[PDB]
Each structure stands twice: as structure tokens, then as C-alpha cells.
Amino acid sequence: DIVMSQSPSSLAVSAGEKVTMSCKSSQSLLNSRTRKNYLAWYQQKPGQSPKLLIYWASTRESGVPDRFTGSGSGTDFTLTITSVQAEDLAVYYCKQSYNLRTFGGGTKLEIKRADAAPTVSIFPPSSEQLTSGGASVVCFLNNFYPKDINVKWKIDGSERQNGVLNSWTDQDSKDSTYSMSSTLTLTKDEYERHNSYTCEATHKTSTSPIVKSFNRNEC
Amino acid sequence: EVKLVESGGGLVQSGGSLRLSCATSGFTFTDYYMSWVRQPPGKALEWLGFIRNKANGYTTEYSPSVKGRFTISRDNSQSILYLQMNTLRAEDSATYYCARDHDGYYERFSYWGQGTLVTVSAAKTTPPSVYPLAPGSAAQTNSMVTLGCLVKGYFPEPVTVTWNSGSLSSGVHTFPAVLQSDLYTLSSSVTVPSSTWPSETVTCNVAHPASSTKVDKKIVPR
Numbered sequence: 207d208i209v210m211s212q213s214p215s216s217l218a219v220s221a222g223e224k225v226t227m228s229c230k231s232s233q234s235l236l237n238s239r240t241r242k243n244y245l246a247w248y249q250q251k252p253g254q255s256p257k258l259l260i261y262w263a264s265t266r267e268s269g270v271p272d273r274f275t276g277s278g279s280g281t282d283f284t285l286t287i288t289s290v291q292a293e294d295l296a297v298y299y300c301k302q303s304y305n306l307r308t309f310g311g312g313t314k315l316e317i318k319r320a321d322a323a324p325t326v327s328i329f330p331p332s333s334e335q336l337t338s339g340g341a342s343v344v345c346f347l348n349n350f351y352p353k354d355i356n357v358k359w360k361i362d363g364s365e366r367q368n369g370v371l372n373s374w375t376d377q378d379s380k381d382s383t384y385s386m387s388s389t390l391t392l393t394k395d396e397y398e399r400h401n402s403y404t405c406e407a408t409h410k411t412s413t414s415p416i417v418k419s420f421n422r423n424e425c
Numbered sequence: 426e427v428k429l430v431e432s433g434g435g436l437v438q439s440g441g442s443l444r445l446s447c448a449t450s451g452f453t454f455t456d457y458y459m460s461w462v463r464q465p466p467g468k469a470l471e472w473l474g475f476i477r478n479k480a481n482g483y484t485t486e487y488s489p490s491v492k493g494r495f496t497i498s499r500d501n502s503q504s505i506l507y508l509q510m511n512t513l514r515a516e517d518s519a520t521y522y523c524a525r526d527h528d529g530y531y532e533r534f535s536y537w538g539q540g541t542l543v544t545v546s547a548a549k550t551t552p553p554s555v556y557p558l559a560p561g562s563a564a565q566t567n568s569m570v571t572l573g574c575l576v577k578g579y580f581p582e583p584v585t586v587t588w589n590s591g592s593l594s595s596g597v598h599t600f601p602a603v604l605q606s607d608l609y610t611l612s613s614s615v616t617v618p619s620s621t622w623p624s625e626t627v628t629c630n631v632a633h634p635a636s637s638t639k640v641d642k643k644i645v646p647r
């Protein structure tokens with residue numbers, strides 16, 4: 207049958223540089239009747255539906271920036287993006303339509319940018335939540351790069367790792383940064399036994415962690 | 426002005442059936458093959474099948490992965506595409522897209538819907554609790570101030586979060602939901618000039634379609 211494979215699985219490129227992406231088919235997609243390769247490329251930006259970029263291997267769909275170029279023939283195809291822009295962050299899929307249709311597994315394109323320190327904000331549990339017996343403490347670490355970051359929670363000065371869940375956004379399409387949320391969930395009873403709640407972010411951008419805290423007595 | 430809009434996604438139990446619809450407009454529906462494509466969260470697109478155009482007798486084809494179990498049909502009077510799914514399993518949990526396909530000449534999927542999310546699970550529908558995230562005790566001399574919304578303990582996905590009914594788009598970060606104990610939690614942050622809040626209102630608008638939940642949570646100071 208027709209197996210589509212893409213390479214690389216993922217890569218990062220700085221704005222303004224060239225991106226090269228590959229698609230292989232297990233059999234030739236060159237239709238002998240029409241003399242065209244039945245191979246299309248789709249761009250799927252984070253949170254969005256796929257969008258057609260290129261079809262018949264090299265035809266750029268109307269409205270698609272000229273920096274996107276499809277090439278290749280038979281079993282091997284290439285999508286090249288020149289002068290990549292922050293907005294080009296996406297998973298790119300190739301798709302054969304020579305015999306029914308089959309998608310490749312995608313190439314994830316991330317955007318390399320200058321290191322950026324997170325902006326850290328901490329939020330105490332709301333009275334609405336506490337009333338029902340729960341206490342979630344939230345820390346936002348916004349607009350940083352690279353994605354790797356450490357968050358530590360301290361309660362009255364002591365590290366706590368139990369009950370902490372983290373979530374990273376996909377890269378931002380405008381500024382190529384990441385953000386992450388860290389949420390520490392406690393019971394109200396346990397929350398009320400301590401005073402100081404601290405989120406500490408350590409990122410390669412500083413040897414000093416960014417520390418945000420609040421004290422329950424100050425609420 | 427081509428429009429494709431899927432509906433029908435939601436929670437179904439293993440072994441169950443579910444039919445999706447895709448309402449279309451802005452093109453001559455009968456001229457076009459229509460495909461369904463799905464995407465498990467975080468995974469690749471998978472083509473499922475198509476139904477051919479009128480010139481080709483509206484006949485269907487399917488990927489081996491779903492042939493015999495999924496059925497595609499179309500209403501050519503109303504320009505609606507359907508996907509009937511039977512004997513659903515966890516591996517069928519995915520976003521389902523309808524896509525406009527072949528018109529007898531062009532080889533391309535020109536247009537795709539927004540997708541509808543199907544969750545196959547024995548877990549019960551649970552509406553979110555929505556909590557405001559307002560700054561504690563720390564003046565934002567930071568020129569900018571960051572507020573948030575915690576959307577906790579819901580099932581299944583998805584939820585939608587907007588800020589001031591979509592008026593605030595820039596400076597918004599909505600964090601992917603994390604699953605814990607059969608329940609999802611997510612949060613959303615918004616960052617606005619400190620001169621605009623709390624003098625101006627900032628409200629997160631949360632919807633959880635599975636429970637028809639609609640919440641508008643005003644972020645209040647003090």
C-alpha cells in the first residue's frame with residue numbers, strides 16, 4: 207500500500223533562515239496519465255486545522271506566501287521555506303492522493319530565537335474554591351525561551367513536589383516564546399496550616415531564580 | 426466564502442456509535458469529493474475515507490483502518506456531509522475534520538473544517554469549576570498586570586476560554602489541559618496594562634460544550 211514518511215520529525219530554525227523538509231512515498235506518486243505527482247503539503251499551526259500549501263508537488267496555492275516551495279518527483283518530495291517567519295511555526299504534513307489518500311507523520315517546525323527570561327506571576331486560591339474545600343495555587347511563567355525551565359514550590363520555606371502539575375503552551379506564533387503554568391493543589395485544611403507560598407523559576411537566562419510569593423496572612 | 430463546520434463530537438462509551446456532521450457552504454457541494462480525516466491529540470493526521478462527487482455516483486471508499494465500521498454519506502440538498510462511526514474504541518478518540526477533496530481534476534484538499542473532538546471513554550461528563558486568578562499582595566509596578574482563569578476538574582475535553590468576549594486576544598495564553606484522576610484542568614492567563622485593570626473590567630468566558638456550561642468570571646481586585 208502507500209506509506210508516507212517525513213523527515214525530520216522536528217527541527218528549529220531562526221527567523222530569516224531556510225527550512226528544508228522531506229517526504230518519502232513507498233511508491234511513485236507520478237501519475238502516468240496526467241504526468242503529475244499527486245502529492246500535497248499542509249501546514250497545521252498550533253490549535254488550528256490543517257491548511258493547504260502546495261499540491262501536485264510544486265503548485266503553490268493562491269494566498270500562500272512565496273517563501274513556501276514544493277519540489278521533488280516520484281518517491282521523494284521536499285518543502286522548502288525561505289526566510290522563515292515566526293508565524294511559520296507549525297506541523298507540516300505531506301499527503302499522497304495517487305491511491306485514495308495517506309498522510310505522512312508530520313514535521314514539527316519550531317522557531318529558534320534569543321533566550322528570554324520568564325515573567326512570573328503567582329495567584330492564591332480563590333475564596334470560591336476554598337469554600338468547596340480545595341486550594342489551588344497557580345504560577346504563570348510567561349514568554350520565555352528556551353522551553354526548558356524548572357519550577358519549585360515552597361511552603362513556609364520548604365520544597366513541596368507532591369500535587370504539582372505543569373503545562374507548557376506551544377510556541378507563540380508572534381514572539382516565538384513559550385509559557386507554562388504550574389498549579390499546586392492542596393486541601394483547604396492543609397493550605398490553612400501554612401503561611402508562605404512561593405513559586406521559584408530557574409531558567410538558563412539567570413543563575414538567580416525568579417521568586418514570586420504570597421503570604422496567606424496578607425490576603 | 427467557503428465554510429465547513431463539523432458538529433456531533435463529544436463523549437461516547439467504548440462500543441458505542443456516534444455520527445458526525447459537516448455543514449458546508451460557498452461552493453458547489455455536489456461537484457466535490459468530500460473526505461474525513463482524524464487526529465488523535467498530539468498525533469498525525471489520518472485519512473479515513475471519502476465520498477465521491479455526483480459525476481462519480483457519490484460512491485464511498487475507506488481506509489482499511491475503519492472500513493466496515495465507519496460509513497460516510499452526504500445530503501446533497503443541504504450540502505451536509507456525514508460520518509457514522511460504530512463500535513468505537515479509545516483509539517478512535519480524536520479530532521475529526523471534514524475536508525473538501527477532489528472535483529474530478531484538482532488533487533488537493535482545498536478546505537478543512539475546524540474539527541470536532543470525539544472522546545471514547547467510560548468516564549462521566551463533569552462540568553468545570555471556574556476560578557478567578559487575581560493578583561495577591563504585590564503591586565504591579567511591572568507596568569503590565571497578569572490575570573487568569575483556572576478551569577478545573579472537567580471531562581471530557583474541550584473547553585473554550587476567551588477574555589472579554591474575544592476583545593482581548595493579544596497577551597492571552599491558554600495552557601493545554603492536563604488529565605488527572607479522570608478530570609482535566611487548564612488555566613488561561615491574560616496580560617493587560619495595569620492602567621486598564623481594575624478600572625476596566627476583565628472577564629474570562631468559559632464554555633464546556635459537553636455539559637453546556639457557560640461561565641463568565643469577572644476578575645475582581647481587593
Ligand SMILES: C=CCO[C@]1(C(=O)O)C[C@@H](O[C@]2(C(=O)O)C[C@@H](O)[C@@H](O)[C@@H]([C@H](O)CO[C@]3(C(=O)O)C[C@@H](O)[C@@H](O)[C@@H]([C@H](O)CO)O3)O2)[C@@H](O)[C@@H]([C@H](O)CO)O1
Pocket residue numbers: 237239303304305306477481527529530532
Ligand atoms: C476505469 C476507469 C478509468 O479511468 C481513467 C483511468 O484510470 O485511466 C481515469 C479517468 O479520469 C477521471 C475522469 O473521469 O475523467 C478524472 C480523474 O481526475 C479522476 O477523477 C478519475 C476517477 O474518478 C478516479 O479518481 C480517483 C478515485 O475516485 O479513486 C480520485 C483521484 O483523486 C485520484 O486518486 C484517482 C487516481 O489517480 C486514479 O485515477 O482516483 O476520473 C478517465 O480519464 C478515464 C477515461 O474516461 C477512460 O475510461 O480513464
Ligand SMILES: [Mg+2]
Pocket residue numbers: 348349378385596597598
Ligand atoms: Mg505571551
Ligand SMILES: [Mg+2]
Pocket residue numbers: 361362399400401
Ligand atoms: Mg507551616
Ligand SMILES: [Zn+2]
Pocket residue numbers: 396399400
Ligand atoms: Zn503542612
